[PDB]
Amino acid sequence: DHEAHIKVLRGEPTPEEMAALMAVLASAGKERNMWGHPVDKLRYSVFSWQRVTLLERTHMRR
Amino acid sequence: SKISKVLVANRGEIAVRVIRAAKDAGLASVAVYAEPDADAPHVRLADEAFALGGQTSAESYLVFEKILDAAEKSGANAIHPGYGFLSENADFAQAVIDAGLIWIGPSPQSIRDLGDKVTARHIAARAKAPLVPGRYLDKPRHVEAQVIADQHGNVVVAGTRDCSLQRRFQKLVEEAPAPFLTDAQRKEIHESAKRICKEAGYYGAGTVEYLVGQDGLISFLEVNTRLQVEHPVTEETSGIDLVRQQFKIANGEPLDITEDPTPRGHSFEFRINGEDAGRGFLPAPGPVTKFVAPTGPGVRMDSGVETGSVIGGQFDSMLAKLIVTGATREEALERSRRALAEFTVEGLATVIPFHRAVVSDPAFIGDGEKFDVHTRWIETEWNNTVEPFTGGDPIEEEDTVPRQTVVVEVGGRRLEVSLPGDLAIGGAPGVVRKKPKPRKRGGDAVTAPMQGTVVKVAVEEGQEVSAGDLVVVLEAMKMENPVTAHKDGTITGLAVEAGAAITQGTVIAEIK
Amino acid sequence: SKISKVLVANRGEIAVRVIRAAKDAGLASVAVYAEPDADAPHVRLADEAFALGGQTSAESYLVFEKILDAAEKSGANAIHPGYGFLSENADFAQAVIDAGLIWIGPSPQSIRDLGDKVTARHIAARAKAPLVPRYLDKPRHVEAQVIADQHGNVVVAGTRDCSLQRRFQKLVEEAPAPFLTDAQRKEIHESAKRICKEAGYYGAGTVEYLVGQDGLISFLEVNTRLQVEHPVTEETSGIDLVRQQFKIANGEPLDITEDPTPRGHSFEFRINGEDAGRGFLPAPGPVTKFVAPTGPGVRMDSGVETGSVIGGQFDSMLAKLIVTGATREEALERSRRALAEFTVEGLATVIPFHRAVVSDPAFIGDGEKFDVHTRWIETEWNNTVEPFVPRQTVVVEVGGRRLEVSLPGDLAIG
């Protein structure tokens, strides 16, 4: 077991206080669509390395 | 002549203590500091402080000329040596008296006479101290008589201390008055100490150490010729301020106290060493990232360190001393069980968990007529349940998850609750948790396993060594640390020399 | 009938002192805190702690309902008052007895009878206490520490001098009361015994007297509590007065048969958060730094630490500095050290006043007498001190109980 458990560091709640505490704590708390992605709206020089390191990288990263 | 300005030729807690005694006397106090101590409390607490300009205990504190030069420049008219360092160096005491400063301590001659073991044996003989017959002992107790001795030869026995908790030859917990002794044993220890000190011509503060067998036979051990570390329990059990007494005697004023004070109450001292009891009390450097002293009823605490202090490998591990006192030994133990539970130190390993245990261990509580403790008890009989110090390091996979600590009120109960940052109860960009590796490596290079100084170089360049041969002895924390050849070969490079400071990971030599 | 778990009904220095005494006895210590104190040292040091709520004493520590309720919720078996608050409220003491908790204090009838000067004065006359015949011009205030017994034994732990006072508020305290003649001392001791035995007093309390320049003693008052300046008597006599309160509340006869001879001398200096440069008005604010004086001959009992905030909602007192020595002059010397080491930052304190008075010939004396009187700080001391987010709550029902629950409103998780 290596989950990060809740710790009560100080004091000792009796069972009913434990249950009230836990119940209140329990109460509170990738579809790609590149269409018109900003990187497509940018305008790149024909020899711009950003065509590799920004545009293509952004499209390919999945 | 009259003392007016005292140079406190020492560091840490005893420096603090002598500064405070000076201020109570209304004397001026001059501290000295090595470069690791430039931020130390006592440099600020003293009325003045002078830099010894040295990286290590030898070049900073122990060279006589730097302390005498500090005395000159400050115009200090007396020197108090504290304990250790030069407090036992009779040649330094002589050089001080040659300079004409009031040496606050015993005469150089009596320091030599009681320092030489054979000469001291002859002294104890003439004195007719209770020497042991001759005889090997099984499980002796250790009992100290505090001596206050006038320059005029008046002597009082301020009381007794039991110091049987010693690990390897270094006292860790002490108590006053020495419990569980017959009045005949008290009579013997007292009047033997009187006789012994005047047969030595002694004056000043002093202490005679006795070693008491399970047969009850007292034996003399030696006279320490200086103020003890444990003196505070004698101050908390006798109406005496021993450092001010020592000032008076160095003034040559007579003893105001004519007869042995009646021991009243019981007082324990616990040495708060920067040593991990969970790893055999090996001392280690580190910051004091938090210090919070016990306070209040029946508590005293003397510390050389504060929050944000740094402790390095150059000096003794003792951070502070806790004294706890009460009307009865049982009451004093109860108060100890409070104070040691209130004590929190953070940032480095400390023996506080050992103190917490031993003050709760039946072997030390005793049956009401004797206890079981003896000089080897910690080394051989104490059940060491203390887990090794790991500080704040994450060491298991679950530790790596950040936590938020909150205060919760539940029916009026106050709870402290630590909640994981990702807690799922009630319902990541590829994050992974796994057990972190510790910071530990594992060639030809022999490398220094810790920072320290090179006390001995065991080899010469071109020497053939085999695996397991000694290469150097490092001192760290005033503690010997052999470093040995990991494989056979010719010693080459050998970049160290004796007395050099050495940082962790430094190449000592390389074996080819 | 035997104490097992003590609710400490008060805050601050006495809260800590009783928590510590309880831990020494090995009793379970339960603290209560109002909203301003929700992380105070006593709240974190106590073995258990309960929120009273409310922003003021009238909303909190004084509400009989809340304190008895907290005692129930804790399952306490005894209630210990400090000084102040309900420590001398006879009606509350009775309410506690009705609750059947061990009230670690004097019996309600004694509190009631001694709380009326008329009834109390009658009692004093019946006891043949030394009584004022005139007005004392410049009296010296001296009191005796009683440790009575449910079996009617009484021990007088000592005389204590409190003559450095302002607005009838004490500022510096001494034990044993200095420069008293032996005749005065005997009169005071035997009178404290007579008067409290006539009063039927169960346990710990202070009998207070005025002494004039002629050295005649007059009885002043009996205060039916372990008064705040008890530590000087503790350090002089070695009686752990709080643990004596525990024994007396148990109804155990005293271990002490005869008045303990004082070992030496001790002073107490109240570290009030009051600026003598503005004439001792409160100075609310942060305690941004609190370095306690430390080591030989010095004890600190404190209700504040670095980062505490102080407000007028409660009394100005922050700590007691206690200094002990073999002699008056030695103890004054040690105090002149300790008060110099004591460093507070971020709010004004009487510390400069203490540094002055421990340096002042009127308080040093000449070796046979000294000049301080209960008004001397006012009438005669040359004052030279230079002037210096919310909580969410949820009310839950659980099968046996209602439980209100409170969380930081900024709580977020997962």
Short mmCIF file of C-alpha atoms in Angstrom, two decimals, chain B residues 17 19-21 23-25 45 235-241 244 261-265 293-303 326-327 330-331 334-335 338 342 404 406-414 419-424, chain C residues 17 20-21 23-25 33 38-39 43-45 48-51 73-74 236-240 243 260-263 293-302 326 330 333-334 337 341 391 402-408 411-414:
data_model
loop_
_atom_site.label_atom_id
_atom_site.label_comp_id
_atom_site.label_asym_id
_atom_site.label_seq_id
_atom_site.Cartn_x
_atom_site.Cartn_y
_atom_site.Cartn_z
CA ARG B 17 27.62 30.34 30.65
CA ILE B 19 29.63 35.31 29.67
CA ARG B 20 26.43 35.22 31.74
CA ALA B 21 28.35 34.71 34.98
CA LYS B 23 27.50 39.87 33.43
CA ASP B 24 26.04 38.81 36.78
CA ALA B 25 29.37 39.78 38.36
CA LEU B 45 26.09 37.81 23.70
CA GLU B 235 23.91 24.53 40.99
CA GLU B 236 20.25 23.37 40.83
CA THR B 237 20.74 21.27 44.00
CA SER B 238 23.10 23.47 46.07
CA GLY B 239 22.68 27.17 46.79
CA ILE B 240 25.84 27.84 44.80
CA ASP B 241 26.75 29.68 41.61
CA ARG B 244 30.96 33.02 40.46
CA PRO B 261 25.39 22.78 51.57
CA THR B 262 22.49 20.51 52.45
CA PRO B 263 21.40 18.81 49.19
CA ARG B 264 17.81 19.89 48.59
CA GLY B 265 15.71 18.62 45.70
CA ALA B 293 13.22 24.75 24.22
CA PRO B 294 11.14 23.31 27.06
CA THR B 295 10.21 26.04 29.54
CA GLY B 296 8.54 26.67 32.86
CA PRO B 297 8.30 24.88 36.19
CA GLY B 298 11.40 22.99 37.25
CA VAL B 299 13.18 23.52 33.92
CA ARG B 300 16.48 25.14 32.95
CA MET B 301 18.07 24.96 29.51
CA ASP B 302 21.53 26.15 28.41
CA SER B 303 22.19 26.16 24.66
CA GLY B 326 12.07 18.84 41.67
CA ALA B 327 11.41 18.19 45.35
CA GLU B 330 10.39 10.78 41.46
CA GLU B 331 9.01 14.31 40.99
CA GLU B 334 7.98 13.29 36.19
CA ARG B 335 9.09 16.83 35.29
CA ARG B 338 7.26 16.63 30.64
CA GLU B 342 8.07 19.36 24.97
CA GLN B 404 -2.12 20.19 2.78
CA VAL B 406 -5.65 21.87 7.94
CA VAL B 407 -7.25 22.38 11.36
CA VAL B 408 -10.72 20.79 11.63
CA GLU B 409 -13.36 21.35 14.32
CA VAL B 410 -15.61 18.33 14.92
CA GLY B 411 -18.10 18.50 17.78
CA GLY B 412 -15.70 21.04 19.24
CA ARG B 413 -12.76 18.65 19.15
CA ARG B 414 -9.74 20.29 17.54
CA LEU B 419 -4.89 15.71 3.35
CA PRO B 420 -3.14 14.59 0.13
CA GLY B 421 -3.16 17.07 -2.74
CA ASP B 422 -4.70 14.47 -5.08
CA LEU B 423 -7.01 12.68 -2.62
CA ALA B 424 -9.72 10.77 -4.50
CA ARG C 17 1.27 26.11 33.88
CA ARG C 20 2.29 21.20 32.58
CA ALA C 21 1.40 20.37 36.19
CA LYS C 23 1.26 16.27 32.54
CA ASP C 24 3.68 15.93 35.46
CA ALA C 25 0.97 14.26 37.54
CA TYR C 33 -9.91 28.17 23.54
CA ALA C 38 -7.31 29.11 18.17
CA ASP C 39 -3.57 28.35 17.82
CA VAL C 43 -4.08 25.18 22.65
CA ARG C 44 -1.29 23.29 20.90
CA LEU C 45 0.42 22.03 24.09
CA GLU C 48 -6.90 17.80 24.08
CA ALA C 49 -8.45 21.11 23.03
CA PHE C 50 -12.02 22.32 22.53
CA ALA C 51 -13.33 25.44 20.80
CA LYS C 73 -17.74 16.63 25.52
CA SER C 74 -14.21 15.98 26.78
CA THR C 236 11.72 29.67 47.12
CA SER C 237 9.93 26.85 48.99
CA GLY C 238 9.89 24.02 46.42
CA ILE C 239 6.20 23.24 46.95
CA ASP C 240 4.67 22.51 43.53
CA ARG C 243 0.19 19.54 42.38
CA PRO C 260 9.29 25.08 54.71
CA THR C 261 12.23 27.35 55.44
CA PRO C 262 12.85 29.53 52.35
CA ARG C 263 16.07 28.50 50.62
CA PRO C 293 16.13 34.88 28.64
CA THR C 294 17.74 31.55 29.27
CA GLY C 295 20.05 29.46 31.40
CA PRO C 296 21.24 29.89 34.97
CA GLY C 297 18.77 31.05 37.60
CA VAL C 298 15.99 31.96 35.16
CA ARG C 299 12.55 30.47 34.48
CA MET C 300 10.01 31.61 31.89
CA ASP C 301 6.28 30.90 31.92
CA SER C 302 4.81 32.30 28.73
CA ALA C 326 20.83 32.80 47.11
CA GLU C 330 22.43 38.08 43.76
CA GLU C 333 22.11 40.94 39.61
CA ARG C 334 20.66 37.90 37.83
CA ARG C 337 21.16 40.11 33.29
CA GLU C 341 18.80 39.39 27.45
CA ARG C 391 -14.36 29.61 8.74
CA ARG C 402 -25.52 16.76 16.77
CA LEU C 403 -22.04 17.78 15.62
CA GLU C 404 -21.24 21.18 14.26
CA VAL C 405 -18.13 21.00 12.09
CA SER C 406 -15.86 23.86 11.08
CA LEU C 407 -13.35 24.03 8.25
CA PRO C 408 -11.24 26.79 6.74
CA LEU C 411 -10.37 24.41 2.05
CA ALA C 412 -9.90 22.69 -1.30
CA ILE C 413 -8.87 19.13 -2.10
CA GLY C 414 -8.52 16.68 -4.98
#
